[PDB]
Symmetry: C3
Subunit: 205 residues, 3 copies
């Protein structure tokens, strides 16, 4: 489509809108947001999220959901998909993505991020600024790999998990679903579903 | 100006001189240094720092202060500014800097570094090799973000603070002025002025 | 040479083969491997490692040894060199390598990696995804700097040492030979030969 609607005009949204602008492929980039009006960082906020169900045509707008919170991103993305909107994979020109990587709709790969050979990312993943996902990783739906986090080869990350800024994993580690790993967490073993961990090595909080 | 004088021909200076050379915009790049003579890494050392006040014309030379120590960088930069020299912001071709970032004179952004949307860097900041400054950060004057350090969104770093190699911050953290955070420090709360911290999480030393 | 044989078709091998493909300089890229047959990631496995001594001509094939294990990489690389094969330094287009860096045969520098001014890398080094080696470092033979690890200026790393994913060093630190530093290790002092360390700060295990 000629236009992109970025849902969420917070800080993450600003970065995503600049990423899209850098691609040079959209005729117009706009925000939907429920808390701010006017324009943000030079992009217009054309309305609230009610426009998605009520106004925007999937024949005119692509959608990206720029919400950091994984549960909310999931809810909005699934609603957009259900309404028939395209959810482009947005990859910054300064990211490096392997030609053998597979990346699901609605995912965003930020400046300086790397996704290596054989990795599989499901829907709505964020690989944030300078984060790396090495070969043969599996990142399930709505996972957030925060800025500067580094996953070793063969790391699996379960659905909706958040891996904090500057965190890392040892090779062949498995993180379950709904896991929170704090900034700087050093994941050296498998982490069960629903756990919050932090530290070096990462331990339950 | 056609020429650049890099003050400081140590290791940091070598990297800064190569950064400038990569820009392909200067007719000549030279060093001022007080400890070495001849040439360093193929760039001539044309004299000591006494040339700044006594010899160099601001109509012919731009200045960059390639001194890692934040206090000394401050002293020399302020002296250069007072003598009317231009202090270009030097951004490596392989850095990514947001078009909405604001960066003060004399700052240096190294290869693979990223500065994201809405960030404000004051004078004489170093964002070193592969360091990232995410959206809406504020880095005050003569801050050094060391190689591979990653600041989350909305991180504030006070004047002259040094954030060590591989360190990181959680979102919305505030580091005061004159703070030293050691290599690998994981900054998970606000850090008062003048403190030295290290560890995961970062604690006072 | 017109052709490249990548020895090792595991995950590391897949990344190395894609790196070579990105260079656009080889007429053909193939694998030797002892555990897999057919093709891997779209590159043919033309035989086992017995082809090196018995079949491949050094007048037709360049060799790279895509084995993560430093001792095995050393053994195979030294054998290839002894049989007269060229062992190109392979640098990903998205890596940044200083024009004043020196890098020994058989070394590999991955996407987003940086090697800064005055650094010296001996034979068979791996600088993995987004790892950085700052100015004036010395990395001895068959060292592996894992993804996202960051070495400060003037870091020396002894022969065959493995520096884990997301690890970092303080400036002017010396790591001995045969050292293992775990993922996330924060190297703040010198590490004697043969030691295994981990933690923040890195301590013996």
């Amino acid at each position: 489509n000629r236009k992109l609607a970025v849902i969420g005009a917070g800080g993450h949204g600003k970065v995503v809108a600049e990423l899209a602008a850098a691609l040079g492929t959209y005729g117009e980039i706009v925000f939907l947001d429920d808390r701010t009006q006017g324009s943000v960082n030079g992009f217009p906020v054309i309305g609230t999220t009610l426009l998605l169900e009520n106004s925007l045509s999937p024949e005119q707008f692509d959608i990206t959901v720029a919400v950091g919170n994984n549960r909310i991103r999931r809810q909005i993305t699934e609603n957009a998909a259900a309404l028939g909107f395209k959810l482009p994979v947005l990859i910054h020109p300064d990211a490096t993505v392997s030609p053998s990587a597979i990346i699901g709709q609605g995912s965003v790969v930020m400046a300086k991020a790397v996704v290596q050979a054989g990795s599989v990312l499901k829907d709505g993943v964020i690989v944030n600024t300078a984060a790396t996902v090495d070969h043969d990783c599996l990142l399930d739906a709505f996972v957030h790999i925060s800025p500067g986090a580094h996953l070793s080869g063969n790391t699996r990350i379960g659905e909706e998990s958040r891996i904090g800024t500057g965190a890392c994993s040892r090779q062949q580690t498995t993180v379950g679903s709904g896991v929170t790993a704090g900034a700087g967490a050093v994941i050296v073993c498998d982490i069960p579903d629903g756990m919050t961990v932090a530290g070096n090595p990462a331990k339950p909080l």
